[PDB]
Coordinates of all heavy atoms in Angstrom, one line a residue:
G1 N 13.6 7.8 -18.7 CA 12.3 7.0 -18.7 C 12.2 6.2 -20.0 O 11.1 5.7 -20.2
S2 N 13.2 6.3 -20.9 CA 13.2 5.5 -22.2 C 13.5 4.0 -21.9 O 14.5 3.7 -21.1 CB 14.1 6.1 -23.1 OG 15.5 6.0 -22.8
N3 N 12.7 3.1 -22.4 CA 13.1 1.7 -22.4 C 12.6 1.0 -21.1 O 12.7 -0.2 -21.0 CB 14.5 1.3 -22.7 CG 14.8 -0.2 -22.9 OD1 15.1 -0.9 -21.9 ND2 14.5 -0.7 -24.0
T4 N 12.2 1.9 -20.1 CA 11.9 1.3 -18.9 C 10.2 1.3 -18.7 O 9.6 2.2 -19.1 CB 12.5 2.2 -17.7 OG1 12.1 1.6 -16.4 CG2 12.0 3.5 -17.8
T5 N 9.8 0.2 -18.1 CA 8.4 0.1 -17.7 C 8.0 0.9 -16.6 O 8.9 1.0 -15.6 CB 8.0 -1.3 -17.5 OG1 8.3 -2.2 -18.5 CG2 6.5 -1.4 -17.1
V6 N 7.0 1.6 -16.6 CA 6.4 2.5 -15.4 C 5.2 1.8 -14.7 O 4.3 1.4 -15.5 CB 6.1 3.9 -16.0 CG1 7.3 4.5 -16.5 CG2 4.9 3.7 -17.0
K7 N 5.3 1.7 -13.5 CA 4.2 1.2 -12.7 C 3.3 2.4 -12.2 O 3.5 2.9 -11.1 CB 4.6 0.3 -11.4 CG 5.5 -0.9 -11.9 CD 4.6 -2.0 -12.4 CE 5.4 -3.3 -12.7 NZ 4.6 -4.4 -13.0
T8 N 2.4 2.7 -13.0 CA 1.5 3.9 -12.7 C 0.5 3.5 -11.6 O 0.4 2.4 -11.2 CB 0.8 4.4 -13.9 OG1 0.0 3.5 -14.5 CG2 1.9 4.9 -15.0
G9 N -0.3 4.5 -11.2 CA -1.3 4.2 -10.2 C -2.2 5.4 -10.0 O -2.2 6.3 -10.8
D10 N -3.1 5.3 -9.1 CA -4.1 6.3 -8.8 C -4.7 6.1 -7.5 O -4.8 5.0 -6.9 CB -5.2 6.2 -9.8 CG -6.3 7.3 -9.6 OD1 -6.1 8.2 -8.9 OD2 -7.3 7.3 -10.4
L11 N -5.1 7.3 -6.8 CA -5.8 7.3 -5.5 C -6.7 8.5 -5.5 O -6.3 9.5 -5.9 CB -4.7 7.4 -4.3 CG -3.6 6.3 -4.2 CD1 -2.6 6.7 -3.1 CD2 -4.3 5.0 -3.9
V12 N -7.8 8.2 -4.8 CA -8.9 9.2 -4.7 C -9.4 9.2 -3.3 O -9.5 8.2 -2.7 CB -10.0 8.8 -5.7 CG1 -11.1 9.9 -5.6 CG2 -9.6 8.8 -7.1
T13 N -9.7 10.5 -2.8 CA -10.2 10.5 -1.5 C -11.0 11.8 -1.3 O -10.6 12.8 -2.0 CB -9.2 10.5 -0.3 OG1 -8.4 9.3 -0.4 CG2 -9.9 10.7 1.0
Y14 N -12.2 11.9 -0.8 CA -13.1 13.0 -0.6 C -13.3 13.3 0.8 O -13.7 12.4 1.6 CB -14.3 12.8 -1.4 CG -15.4 13.9 -1.2 CD1 -15.1 15.1 -1.9 CD2 -16.4 13.7 -0.4 CE1 -16.1 16.1 -1.7 CE2 -17.4 14.8 -0.2 CZ -17.2 16.0 -1.0 OH -18.1 17.1 -0.8
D15 N -13.2 14.5 1.2 CA -13.6 15.0 2.5 C -14.8 15.8 2.5 O -14.8 16.9 2.3 CB -12.3 15.9 3.0 CG -12.4 16.3 4.5 OD1 -13.5 16.5 4.9 OD2 -11.3 16.4 5.1
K16 N -15.8 15.0 2.9 CA -17.2 15.6 3.1 C -17.2 16.8 3.9 O -17.9 17.8 3.6 CB -18.2 14.6 3.3 CG -19.7 15.2 3.4 CD -20.7 14.0 3.7 CE -22.1 14.5 3.7 NZ -23.0 13.4 4.1
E17 N -16.5 16.8 5.1 CA -16.5 17.9 5.9 C -16.1 19.2 5.3 O -16.7 20.2 5.5 CB -15.7 17.5 7.1 CG -15.6 18.7 8.2 CD -16.9 18.9 8.8 OE1 -17.9 18.1 8.6 OE2 -17.2 20.0 9.5
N18 N -15.0 19.2 4.5 CA -14.5 20.2 3.8 C -14.8 20.3 2.3 O -14.5 21.4 1.7 CB -12.9 20.4 4.0 CG -12.5 20.4 5.5 OD1 -12.4 21.5 6.0 ND2 -12.5 19.2 6.1
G19 N -15.4 19.3 1.8 CA -15.7 19.4 0.4 C -14.5 19.5 -0.6 O -14.6 20.3 -1.4
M20 N -13.4 18.8 -0.3 CA -12.2 19.0 -0.9 C -11.9 17.6 -1.6 O -11.1 16.9 -1.1 CB -11.1 19.4 0.0 CG -11.5 20.6 0.8 SD -10.2 21.2 1.9 CE -9.0 21.8 0.9
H21 N -12.2 17.5 -2.8 CA -12.0 16.2 -3.6 C -10.5 16.2 -3.9 O -10.1 16.9 -4.8 CB -12.9 16.2 -4.8 CG -12.6 14.9 -5.6 ND1 -13.0 13.7 -5.2 CD2 -12.1 14.8 -6.9 CE1 -12.7 12.9 -6.3 NE2 -12.1 13.5 -7.2
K22 N -9.8 15.4 -3.3 CA -8.3 15.3 -3.5 C -8.0 13.9 -4.2 O -8.5 13.0 -3.9 CB -7.5 15.3 -2.1 CG -8.0 14.2 -1.3 CD -7.0 14.2 0.0 CE -7.1 15.4 0.8 NZ -8.5 15.6 1.4
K23 N -7.1 14.0 -5.2 CA -6.8 12.9 -6.0 C -5.2 12.9 -6.1 O -4.6 14.0 -6.1 CB -7.3 12.9 -7.4 CG -6.6 12.0 -8.4 CD -7.0 12.3 -9.8 CE -6.3 11.5 -10.8 NZ -6.6 10.0 -10.8
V24 N -4.6 11.8 -6.2 CA -3.1 11.6 -6.4 C -2.9 10.6 -7.4 O -3.4 9.5 -7.3 CB -2.5 11.2 -5.0 CG1 -1.0 11.0 -5.3 CG2 -2.8 12.2 -3.9
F25 N -2.2 11.0 -8.5 CA -1.9 10.1 -9.6 C -0.2 10.0 -9.5 O 0.4 11.1 -9.6 CB -2.3 10.7 -10.9 CG -1.9 9.9 -12.1 CD1 -2.8 8.9 -12.6 CD2 -0.6 10.0 -12.6 CE1 -2.4 8.2 -13.7 CE2 -0.3 9.2 -13.7 CZ -1.1 8.2 -14.2
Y26 N 0.3 8.9 -9.4 CA 1.8 8.7 -9.3 C 2.3 7.7 -10.3 O 1.6 6.7 -10.8 CB 2.0 8.1 -7.8 CG 1.5 6.8 -7.6 CD1 2.3 5.6 -7.8 CD2 0.1 6.6 -7.2 CE1 1.7 4.4 -7.6 CE2 -0.4 5.3 -6.9 CZ 0.5 4.2 -7.1 OH -0.1 3.0 -6.9
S27 N 3.5 7.8 -10.6 CA 4.2 7.0 -11.6 C 5.7 6.6 -11.0 O 6.3 7.5 -10.6 CB 4.3 7.6 -12.9 OG 3.1 8.0 -13.4
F28 N 6.0 5.4 -11.1 CA 7.3 5.0 -10.8 C 8.2 4.7 -12.0 O 7.8 3.9 -12.8 CB 7.3 3.5 -10.0 CG 6.7 3.8 -8.6 CD1 5.4 3.7 -8.2 CD2 7.7 3.9 -7.5 CE1 5.1 3.9 -6.8 CE2 7.3 4.2 -6.2 CZ 5.9 4.1 -5.9
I29 N 9.2 5.5 -12.1 CA 10.2 5.4 -13.2 C 11.4 4.7 -12.7 O 12.3 5.5 -12.2 CB 10.4 6.7 -13.9 CG1 9.0 7.4 -14.3 CG2 11.4 6.6 -15.1 CD1 9.1 8.8 -14.9
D30 N 11.6 3.5 -12.9 CA 12.9 2.8 -12.4 C 13.6 2.5 -13.6 O 13.5 1.5 -14.3 CB 12.3 1.4 -11.8 CG 13.6 0.7 -11.1 OD1 14.7 0.9 -11.6 OD2 13.4 0.0 -10.2
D31 N 14.5 3.5 -13.9 CA 15.4 3.5 -15.1 C 16.8 3.0 -14.6 O 17.4 3.4 -13.6 CB 15.5 4.9 -15.7 CG 16.2 4.9 -17.0 OD1 17.1 3.9 -17.2 OD2 16.1 5.8 -17.9
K32 N 17.2 1.9 -15.4 CA 18.6 1.3 -15.0 C 19.7 2.3 -15.2 O 20.6 2.5 -14.4 CB 18.8 0.1 -15.8 CG 18.7 0.3 -17.3 CD 19.0 -1.0 -18.0 CE 18.8 -0.9 -19.5 NZ 17.4 -0.4 -19.9
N33 N 19.6 3.0 -16.4 CA 20.6 4.1 -16.6 C 20.6 5.2 -15.5 O 21.7 5.7 -15.2 CB 20.4 4.7 -18.0 CG 20.6 3.7 -19.1 OD1 21.4 2.7 -19.0 ND2 19.8 3.8 -20.1
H34 N 19.5 5.7 -15.1 CA 19.4 6.8 -14.2 C 20.1 6.5 -12.9 O 20.3 5.2 -12.5 CB 18.0 7.2 -13.9 CG 17.8 8.6 -13.3 ND1 18.9 9.4 -13.3 CD2 16.7 9.2 -12.8 CE1 18.4 10.6 -12.8 NE2 17.2 10.5 -12.5
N35 N 20.7 7.5 -12.3 CA 21.4 7.3 -11.1 C 20.6 6.7 -9.9 O 21.0 5.8 -9.3 CB 22.1 8.6 -10.6 CG 22.8 8.5 -9.3 OD1 22.4 7.9 -8.3 ND2 24.0 9.1 -9.4
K36 N 19.3 7.2 -9.8 CA 18.5 6.8 -8.6 C 17.0 6.6 -8.9 O 16.6 7.3 -10.0 CB 18.7 7.8 -7.5 CG 18.5 9.3 -7.8 CD 18.7 10.1 -6.6 CE 20.1 10.1 -6.2 NZ 20.4 11.1 -5.0
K37 N 16.3 5.9 -8.3 CA 14.9 5.8 -8.4 C 14.2 7.2 -8.6 O 14.6 8.1 -8.0 CB 14.2 4.9 -7.4 CG 14.7 3.5 -7.5 CD 14.1 2.7 -6.3 CE 14.2 1.1 -6.5 NZ 13.3 0.7 -7.7
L38 N 13.0 7.2 -9.2 CA 12.2 8.3 -9.3 C 10.7 8.1 -9.1 O 10.3 7.0 -9.3 CB 12.4 9.0 -10.7 CG 13.3 10.2 -10.9 CD1 14.7 10.0 -10.4 CD2 13.3 10.9 -12.2
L39 N 10.0 9.1 -8.7 CA 8.6 8.9 -8.4 C 7.9 10.3 -8.7 O 8.4 11.3 -8.0 CB 8.4 8.5 -7.0 CG 7.0 8.0 -6.6 CD1 6.9 7.4 -5.2 CD2 6.0 9.3 -6.5

């Protein structure tokens, strides 16, 4: 993850029926040196 820009993000959703506040925070680490993409 060094020298590479990360395209972060965020998602939020609430299920009133079950009262389960779920959140997802994600980051894309596209490193040229690394073998394959990461998330």
Side-chain angles (χ1 to χ4, degrees):
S2 67
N3 187 267
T4 181
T5 302
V6 297
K7 298 285 184 170
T8 60
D10 181 7
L11 297 175
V12 180
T13 303
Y14 177 70
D15 186 323
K16 183 178 179 180
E17 180 60 16
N18 303 268
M20 310 181 67
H21 178 71
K22 59 170 66 59
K23 163 196 176 68
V24 181
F25 180 99
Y26 65 96
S27 304
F28 284 90
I29 303 176
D30 186 328
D31 186 334
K32 58 182 178 299
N33 295 328
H34 197 13
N35 181 311
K36 52 179 67 176
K37 289 173 167 295
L38 256 61
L39 193 169

